[PDB]
Design an enzyme around this catalytic site. Structure first.
Site, PDB file in Angstrom:
ATOM      1  N   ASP E  26       0.814  -1.190   0.000  1.00 10.40           N
ATOM      2  CA  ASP E  26       0.000   0.000   0.000  1.00 10.40           C
ATOM      3  C   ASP E  26       0.848   1.240   0.000  1.00 10.40           C
ATOM      4  OD1 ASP E  26      -1.900   1.994   0.464  1.00 10.40           O
ATOM      5  OD2 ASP E  26      -2.379   1.279   2.386  1.00 10.40           O
ATOM      6  N   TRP E  51       4.429  -5.301   7.807  1.00 14.33           N
ATOM      7  CA  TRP E  51       3.197  -6.088   7.688  1.00 14.33           C
ATOM      8  C   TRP E  51       3.596  -7.211   6.710  1.00 14.33           C
ATOM      9  CZ3 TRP E  51       3.071  -0.814   5.340  1.00 14.33           C
ATOM     10  CH2 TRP E  51       3.027  -0.887   3.938  1.00 14.33           C
ATOM     11  N   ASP E  70       8.735   0.034   5.149  1.00 11.92           N
ATOM     12  CA  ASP E  70       8.700   1.391   4.601  1.00 11.92           C
ATOM     13  C   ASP E  70       9.995   2.110   4.657  1.00 11.92           C
ATOM     14  OD1 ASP E  70       6.107   0.828   4.178  1.00 11.92           O
ATOM     15  OD2 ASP E  70       5.395   2.097   5.860  1.00 11.92           O
ATOM     16  N   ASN E  98      -2.506  -3.113   6.074  1.00 13.98           N
ATOM     17  CA  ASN E  98      -1.576  -2.269   5.326  1.00 13.98           C
ATOM     18  C   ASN E  98      -1.891  -0.773   5.198  1.00 13.98           C
ATOM     19  OD1 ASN E  98      -3.314  -2.040   3.098  1.00 13.98           O
ATOM     20  ND2 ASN E  98      -2.185  -3.515   1.846  1.00 13.98           N
ATOM     21  N   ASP E  99      -2.945  -0.256   5.846  1.00 15.11           N
ATOM     22  CA  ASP E  99      -3.118   1.188   5.947  1.00 15.11           C
ATOM     23  C   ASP E  99      -2.121   1.835   6.957  1.00 15.11           C
ATOM     24  OD1 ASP E  99      -5.349   0.940   4.245  1.00 15.11           O
ATOM     25  OD2 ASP E  99      -6.567   0.344   5.964  1.00 15.11           O
ATOM     26  N   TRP E 102       3.984   1.779   8.479  1.00 20.71           N
ATOM     27  CA  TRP E 102       4.947   0.897   9.112  1.00 20.71           C
ATOM     28  C   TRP E 102       6.337   1.529   9.091  1.00 20.71           C
ATOM     29  CZ3 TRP E 102       3.004  -2.139  12.205  1.00 20.71           C
ATOM     30  CH2 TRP E 102       1.842  -2.836  11.966  1.00 20.71           C
ATOM     31  N   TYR E 113       5.811   8.771   5.310  1.00 23.85           N
ATOM     32  CA  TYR E 113       5.788   7.710   4.332  1.00 23.85           C
ATOM     33  C   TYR E 113       6.300   8.148   2.973  1.00 23.85           C
ATOM     34  CZ  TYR E 113       4.499   4.005   1.226  1.00 23.85           C
ATOM     35  OH  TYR E 113       4.546   2.960   0.357  1.00 23.85           O
ATOM     36  N   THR E 116       7.632   1.800  -0.223  1.00 27.89           N
ATOM     37  CA  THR E 116       7.671   0.504   0.434  1.00 27.89           C
ATOM     38  C   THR E 116       8.482  -0.516  -0.349  1.00 27.89           C
ATOM     39  OG1 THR E 116       5.492   0.958   1.170  1.00 27.89           O
ATOM     40  CG2 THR E 116       6.219  -1.342   1.241  1.00 27.89           C
TER      41      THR E 116
END
Ligand code: HEC
Ligand code: HEC
Ligand code: HEC
Ligand code: HEC
Ligand SMILES: [Ca+2]
Ligand SMILES: [Ca+2]
Ligand code: NA
Ligand code: NA
Ligand code: NA
Lengths: 376, 125, 354, 376, 125, 357
Positions: E26, E51, E70, E98-99, E102, E113, E116
């Site tokens: 995500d 995740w 991330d 996955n929202d 991480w 963010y 990923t």
């Protein structure tokens, strides 16, 4: 033909198949080289913005740098660092303003300096590459101030400190020529030479007025600091060339980019960065299309390339896309970078022939400014 | 919709980039972010500086001086972006220049650009 | 009728018989040869005028009467700003209320009372016939009716096209009859895009029908005392001119030190400037507005004195939001401004520009 | 028929003709009402974001509020204020983090409080409305924290100060029911009731497990605070309804939003805010479409409207656009708000006929969350 | 291209949202902003949280555990956005949700963010 | 050959005649009934082992020999991480270099020298036969050869399937022969998504052919001194166990306090834990890691003593970047990891799993 993503899938499949281990980590950007290109996205005035570091050869994003409101990117010609004057606010777009200069390592992209600029002194304007500039020795950064009046700030990147503001007359842009000297363009149509020591009023010398009241010179001239050549198009494609390689302004023969018949039929320069100058090739590049007098900031579909000496058109490219900004690598066999604000894509062309080689899409929201180092 | 063609002023929709007063607007029409033709949306700060333009009004065939004023202290609206350049001069003629963020004089020293209004300040010439 | 009224006012305006010693008329201070201002040198130069008595000086600069008929009657408008009226502190509502005050002011025309004014009107056969034909028989026997009718004649006189001819180069350009010089047009552009047009324009927006370069509001722009003028005024070194606050009935302290935005029409020929004639040159007046905007040392100094401007006589209610524009006027724009202002000179005073 | 910008051109034209003067100034937003709708734009994780304040009746943007990184919007039901928990960094997306809560006047949109949150305690996640929540009296803002462990932060909006963190079990979301009480959903399949003072271990009570480990409850349940109805769909369109209006969880009968044949034909819910609840009508609205079971965050084109009491279907609307999120106004004859993250457009439907009525476009980069006040 | 259709993994282009290792990604693929399939771009900070997902690799017929991680401390790249949710569970099963950003354990407390990575960490069971 | 050499090591392994007082074999400390660890109680409980003199205690816990055969020989990799080796401080290069050390260690088996060990071997006719068939005639008469030959036999014996059978439930689950319980599957998921995988998985990415749950690296996780062990060992109240820095040749002060990451196979049955046997319970060893992550006061308390964990023995070069994950393990996740770690127990020790759960 295989794309960067597909090659990447194959290397990955093979590592998994070979049972090859590798440590997840922070990549270093490949060493700065001539084919590196920087796209700055002022993001149509968004309060934060991005810079894309691109390997021009591979058409690949190799890094990014975040900036604040309408930052002014600078790139050391020698490739040893990049920097920007940027502007943040304590609550996104509101509250306390901090103008600051950051210097970055050009491979790890980490900031190496963070130099506050007192009293919020940056000029806030659509990005003009030459409103902030590195002196030749990379030791000093000069940024323009408009408010309360024209002035220029002197930032010491060596001591990592802001020094002072220089009071100047009614002039604009900054073209450093030396550790202590830069020229600006004035409202009377002269250039001003500004020589700053450490203390006192600088010493200001005007050139002769070199254009009239109603000749209009674009906000984005090309300027090669290493070549001392200030390349200045006007709204009609009249290109002023000023040589500043002696310490004082030598005016070159003014040249014309479109022909009288093209001009008659509505050929005009237009876009953002309308002009590139290749130093070794001594060659002006100019974004033009058929347009009304006052559509001078719109994208162009064509580039003309002319000899700086003679003024002869060397090529006309149909860019095949709406282009707002152009620039070129300074290596031999240069790339011609064509940035479309609308497509948010850098189209990388062979500069000799104009064929599209590759492109990098998804470059922000409204990318405008292309910068390259002049490394040789 | 042909961006290089001469601009065709209309007097029938202020949210469109071809609305007559927007002849030298750069940014966003305040009317699309909760302002109106001549007023700023809530939360923003109206600047005292402007860049001026003379804008031909198709309706009375008269030319009006429009002093654009910026509404500041918010991130750019993103709505109804418009960039026109009638009589727009380079930066060294700042009175007619529109790349400049005209937020001088805004309350709280707000200098971030959100949108632009289009009030008439007189008859042109 | 409106004609004959104005013609009567015209007679009164130059009649020194409305002064105590009969040495002074309105025209003495509002000299029609000097855009209706005072050419005469006094203790404090041209900063202030001398009364009928030969020694009494005012504490304010005698303003032009041209275009004064375009000022609305004094009023507080819906957004709370007082507008209009007459005198620099708007203490008179309109031209009619203003007219009579000079006649009775002891530091000016110094008539004892309305009666002595009527008595003077009765001495002139031409006035008996003039007044009687407009206001009726015996008007001059009654001092209230006489004095008020004199004030009406004066007001009508000042409302004639003669005081407000709209024939400056500015008016002729706006009528498409001629062009500005490059500099005048730059000046005009500067005037309308910088802070000046925030106060020296009739309207906030749109096109004004008879522009007189004032929004008729009251502002404290932070001016220092004119030291010699104040000493000549004899109002004392302790004295504070509170501008609008001095109008009877204004009680609101936010108004202390506020003065009416003068019309800039004829500004080139009615120096010295400001409510207290402190600045002799127009250029100086324009430069004063740099004290709020420029960082430079030169901006704190009155060029006429070579010294700092001085503290505002009233160090509060400064119109800071309008005055602190963020931008300084360079020499080029100050020049441009003078040029533009000079175009606001009426035709008949065009000869007075040197 | 006539658009809003046409109405504005006409009225300006007339003001000009009549010599009508107006002072340029800062508008006030119209009073908050039932048809005001807020659209938050997480901007696909950008460091800065926007909320759009919209008059749903006119379909007109009446205001915007800036925010930082993945803010949580809240809107007081009574329309008295709006607020968000937001996150900014000193250098755009890097440096010192400051989490903070701002409270805004809903007409001037001016911030009336700026409350720091110490120790950067916000949960950074794609925006879930119920990860930051107002208590019903509007005096307290409760925000979820995930790291180092699930916790809830208590912010006093009346005294404008952060109060404390509360330790909670392994649970998620915060549904306030009282000035000092909220429920969370726990990993073990129960709800936890959290009752908290100014100091001391919160009282924590678990309901019974209300769903099996293999039934999956979505991240965007609808919660009507004034009804205390928590409407929690599962991946299959199975709807859990929990009645919290007595202050304790009472489990309502499950309804199926889709029929067995529809489920046999691969109909499932999907999107972001998949579910809305109209309190006055006791109606559930679910975004549904034909989709594989692991495409549960994609947009949907249909809304089923079912009676919350019986589970009877009342309508199935063909939305005619790619809708990620729905919400409804809480007035009589409600609007159905249908937000497309793809189109960045809010489509405004009559909730009764499903008819599209108007739309508001250009709502940022990736708008996801619709919030309405419940003002009745 | 039918967003609602069952996700079909491919093993031949890591920059496309159907690359097999991205089955529960995500955000943005780090390869697109200067990183690689399993490394972060310069200037960003590599998180230590992740995740997981079990993604079917159509090259070998085997399913692998992909532990996403991330690259943090930069604004979102904006290049190669993707969102897949194969086996993705709601936030209360955060090891498959996955929202969540991480970015935990990233150096300098970087929590913004940027993009990923999709390294394999096991065979699925 | 590969059969015989191992067979000869099988014999040496259980032979107490390789200790001074003939009381102690490798099997005495590395007990095959207990996954090759020492079930014996000494002055520091099971934290450290007692040598052949019946009195000397070591300073480190006796590690399992299970799966030690999978550890690479000691080396420094290109990122400058040391890896591999034997002993908790990597001071032996490999099994063979390690094998002679217990034999000569006056704290352990305590033979005075090689000559004394050779003379022991020479007494058993079965060794003269076994050694001579593998190494040649008179091998037992050359004390260097004899001692090297024994080390090699013992290293070969530890490399047999019997030390590393890979027949734990985890192995069986990774084959598809069975499934994890829901508790174990969640434990497994935690393990691979949390910081444990940064240290207790062979590889940084991809799949290991023979996973033994250690990257073989050296890390200081900031363990306190085990007081009762340290007192029993007699090394002194001022002594610091420098970990890897004690390996001759390592000079780098940044290696002080770093210990080899242990294989977590059979971890459920090889308590007590860490290099000094400081924690008795598996759960304790897992709870230690919360001290870097949790904000709760309980996270700084050793549940076994009710007192703070203790100042690190070496307060420097802590693996703070891995350890400070920003996330705390709740008790669900700790139970889940215990259940997962128990699936790592070899089939033969599955019955020991009962007397600890
Ligand atoms: C010199 C002694 C004067 C004589 C004789 C007259 N006036 Fe005057 N005028 C004078 C001053 C000093 C001022 C301003 C004083 C103040 O308190 O602000 C004025 C002002 C006026 C005005 C108002 C002008 C404006 O506000 O723009 C009017 C309409 C006016 N004066 C008219 C006037 C008439 C009709 C006179 C004959 C009776 C007259 N003045 C005499 C100075 C002197
Ligand atoms: C309101 C905030 C104003 C702004 C901005 C500007 N001016 Fe002004 N002006 C103002 C007042 C209230 C007054 C009288 C002040 C007093 O107390 O006397 C003035 C005066 C002038 C003058 C003197 C004219 C005269 O008849 O004496 C000039 C020439 C003038 N003002 C010009 C001017 C210019 C060019 C400006 C932009 C730089 C400007 N003013 C700003 C009110 C305000
Ligand atoms: C009790 C006194 C022991 C006897 C008899 C033997 N060993 Fe041992 N062993 C012991 C301790 C206390 C330690 C760790 C000490 C340290 O400094 O770290 C060890 C370690 C080993 C190892 C290394 C395993 C690893 O690093 O994971 C091996 C291979 C080993 N032991 C095997 C071994 C053999 C072959 C023995 C008889 C010749 C033997 N041990 C005896 C305690 C004791
Ligand atoms: C490197 C930073 C590590 C991380 C992250 C984790 N572990 Fe670890 N573990 C590590 C070392 C270097 C050691 C030996 C430490 C010493 O000096 O003795 C350990 C030990 C264990 C043990 C005890 C094993 C034994 O004694 O035989 C267990 C049960 C263990 N580790 C588990 C574990 C878990 C569950 C983790 C994630 C929470 C974890 N470790 C992280 C190195 C590192
Ligand atoms: Ca005067
Ligand atoms: Ca042990
Ligand atoms: Na008063
Ligand atoms: Na102990
Ligand atoms: Na050493």
């Amino acid at each position: 033909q295989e794309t960067q993503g597909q090659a990447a899938a194959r290397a990955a499949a093979a590592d998994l198949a070979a049972g090859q281990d590798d440590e997840p980590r922070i990549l270093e950007a490949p060493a700065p080289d001539a084919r590196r290109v920087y796209v700055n996205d002022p993001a149509h005035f968004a309060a934060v913005t991005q810079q894309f570091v691109i390997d021009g050869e591979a058409g690949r994003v190799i890094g990014m740098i975040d900036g604040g409101f309408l930052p002014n990117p600078v790139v050391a010609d020698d490739g040893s660092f990049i920097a920007h004057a940027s502007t943040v606010f304590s609550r996104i777009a509101r509250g306390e303003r901090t103008d600051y200069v950051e210097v970055f390592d050009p491979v790890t992209l980490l900031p190496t300096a963070d130099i506050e600029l007192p009293d919020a002194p940056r000029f806030l304007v659509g990005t003009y590459p030459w409103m902030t500039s590195l002196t030749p020795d990379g030791k000093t950064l000069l940024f323009y101030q408009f408010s309360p009046a024209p002035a220029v700030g002197v930032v010491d990147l060596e001591g990592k400190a802001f020094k002072r503001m220089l009071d100047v007359p009614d002039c604009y842009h900054i073209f450093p020529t030396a550790p202590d000297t830069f020229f600006m363009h004035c409202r009377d149509g002269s250039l001003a030479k500004v020589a700053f020591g450490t203390e006192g009023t600088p010493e200001i010398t005007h050139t002769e007025v070199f254009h009239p009241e109603d000749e209009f010179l674009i906000n984005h001239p090309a300027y090669s600091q290493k070549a001392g050549r200030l390349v200045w198009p006007t709204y009609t494609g009249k290109i002023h060339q000023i040589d500043l390689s002696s310490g004082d302004a030598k005016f070159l023969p003014a040249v014309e980019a479109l022909t009288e018949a093209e001009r008659a039929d509505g050929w005009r320069p237009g876009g953002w960065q309308q002009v590139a100058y290749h130093r070794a090739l001594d060659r002006i590049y100019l974004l033009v299309d058929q347009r009304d007098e006052w559509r001078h900031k719109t994208a162009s579909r064509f580039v003309v390339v002319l000899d700086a000496k003679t003024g002869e058109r060397l090529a006309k490219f149909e860019m095949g896309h709406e282009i707002d900004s152009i620039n070129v690598s300074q290596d031999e066999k240069p790339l011609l970078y064509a940035l479309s604000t609308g497509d948010k894509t850098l189209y990388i062309h062979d500069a000799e022939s104009g064929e599209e080689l590759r492109s990098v899409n998804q470059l922000g929201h409204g990318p405008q400014v292309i910068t390259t180092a002049d490394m040789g | 919709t042909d961006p290089r063609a001469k601009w065709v002023p209309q007097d029938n929709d202020i949210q469109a980039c071809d609305y007559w007063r927007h002849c030298s607007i750069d940014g966003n029409i305040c009317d699309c972010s909760g302002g109106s033709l001549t007023n700023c949306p809530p939360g923003t700060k109206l600047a005292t500086a402007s860049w001026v333009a003379s804008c031909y009004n198709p309706t009375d065939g008269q030319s009006y001086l429009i002093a654009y004023r910026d509404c500041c202290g918010y991130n750019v609206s993103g709505r109804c972006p418009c960039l026109n350049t009638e009589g727009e001069l380079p930066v060294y003629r700042p009175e007619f220049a529109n790349d400049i963020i005209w937020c001088f004089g805004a309350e709280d020293d707000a200098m971030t650009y959100h949108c632009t209004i289009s009030p008439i300040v007189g008859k042109a010439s | 009728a409106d004609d004959a009224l104005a013609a009567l006012g015209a007679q009164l305006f130059v009649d020194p018989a409305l002064s105590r010693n009969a040495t002074q008329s309105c025209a003495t201070c509002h000299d029609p040869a000097r855009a209706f201002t005072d050419p005469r040198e006094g203790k404090a130069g041209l900063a202030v005028s001398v009364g009928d008595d030969g020694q009494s000086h005012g504490d304010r600069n005698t303003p032009t009467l041209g275009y004064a008929a375009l000022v609305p009657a004094f009023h507080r408008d819906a957004n709370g700003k007082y507008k209009g009226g007459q005198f620099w502190d708007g203490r008179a509502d309109d031209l009619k209320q203003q007219a009579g005050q000079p006649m009775l002011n002891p530091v000016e025309m110094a008539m004892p009372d309305r009666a002595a004014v009527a008595a003077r009107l009765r001495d002139d056969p031409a006035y008996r016939t003039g007044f009687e034909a407009l206001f009726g028989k015996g008007v001059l026997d009654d001092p209230e009716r006489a004095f008020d009718a004199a004030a009406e004649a004066l007001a009508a006189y000042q409302a004639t096209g003669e005081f407000s001819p709209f024939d400056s180069k500015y008016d002729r350009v706006m009528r498409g009859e001629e062009k500005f010089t490059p500099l005048e047009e730059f000046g005009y552009t500067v005037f309308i895009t910088w802070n000046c047009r925030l106060c020296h324009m009739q309207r906030k927006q749109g096109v004004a029908e008879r522009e007189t370069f004032t929004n008729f509001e009251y502002h404290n722009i932070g001016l220092p005392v004119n030291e010699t003028a104040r000493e000549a005024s004899g109002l004392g070194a302790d004295h504070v001119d509170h501008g609008l606050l001095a109008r009877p009935g204004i009680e609101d302290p936010a108004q202390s030190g506020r003065f009416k935005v003068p019309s800039l029409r004829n500004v080139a020929v009615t120096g010295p400037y400001m409510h207290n004639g402190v600045f002799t040159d127009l250029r100086t007046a324009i430069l004063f507005y740099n004290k709020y905007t420029s960082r430079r040392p030169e901006a704190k100094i009155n060029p006429e004195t070579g010294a700092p401007w001085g503290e505002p006589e009233v160090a509060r209610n400064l119109s800071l939001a309008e005055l602190q524009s963020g931008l300084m006027l360079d020499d080029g724009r100050v020049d441009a401004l003078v040029a533009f202002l000079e175009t606001l000179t009426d035709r008949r005073y065009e000869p007075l520009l040197e």
